Write a protein that binds this ligand. Sequence first.
Ligand SMILES: *CC(=O)N1CCCN(C(=O)c2ccc(-c3ccccc3)c(C)c2)CC1
Length: 197
Amino acid sequence: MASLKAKVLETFLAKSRPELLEYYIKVILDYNTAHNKVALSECYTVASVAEMPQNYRPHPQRFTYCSQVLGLHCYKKGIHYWEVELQKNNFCGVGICYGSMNRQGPESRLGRNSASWCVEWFNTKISAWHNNVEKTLPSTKATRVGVLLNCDHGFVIFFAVADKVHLMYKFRVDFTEALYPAFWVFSAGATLSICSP
Ligand SMILES: *CC(=O)N1CCCN(C(=O)c2ccc(-c3ccccc3)c(C)c2)CC1
C-alpha cells in the first residue's frame, strides 16, 4: 500500500507539536541495558554521563562497549511519539533500535548497524545515522528532539522541537521486529531527559 504509506508520512511530517502529542507514549529507561558510564535518575527518566564508571550487575542485555541505554518497552504496532530534552553543546544521540541489536563490541553503536537509526550530536555537528552511513544535517538551536515512530506504515521521524517543530530527518523502513527507544551519552555533563509535557 505505497500510496497510503506516502500520504500518512506526509500527514505526520506536517503535524504541529500539539498534534504529535496526541500520539505521546511514556518512555522509561531500562536499568538492565545501561552501560556503566550511563547514570540514571528521576525514576529512570534521565540519562547522564557518570564521571566514574558504575558497577551495574551483569546482564546479557547490558551495553558493554558504548555508553548507551534503551527504553523499557518495545513497539511493533501503532504510532508512538516521545520527546527528549538535551543539554546543549554535548556529544549524545537519540534513536531507535531492534532488540536483536548487539549489546557488545563496535557493532552495538547506534546508527552503525542495520538494526538502529539515530540522530547524533558529535563535535557540535548534527548527523543522522543508519547502517554505518552518516548524513550531515543543518544545526538547530533546539534543545529537544521528538521521535515519531509509525510502526503501521513504516517510518520514523526525528523532529527538532522548539516554539515549533522542524524536521531533522526521517527514515522509511518496513520494520522486521519491535523497536526500542535508544539513547547515547558521551561528553561530560551530557544529559538526555524524557520529558513529561
Ligand atoms: C560508542 C561508545 O560510546 N564507546 C565508548 C566511548 C569511546 N568509544 C568510541 O568509539 C569513541 C572514541 C572517540 C570519540 C570522540 C571524542 C571526542 C571527539 C571526537 C570523538 C567518541 C565520541 C567515541 C568506544 C565506544
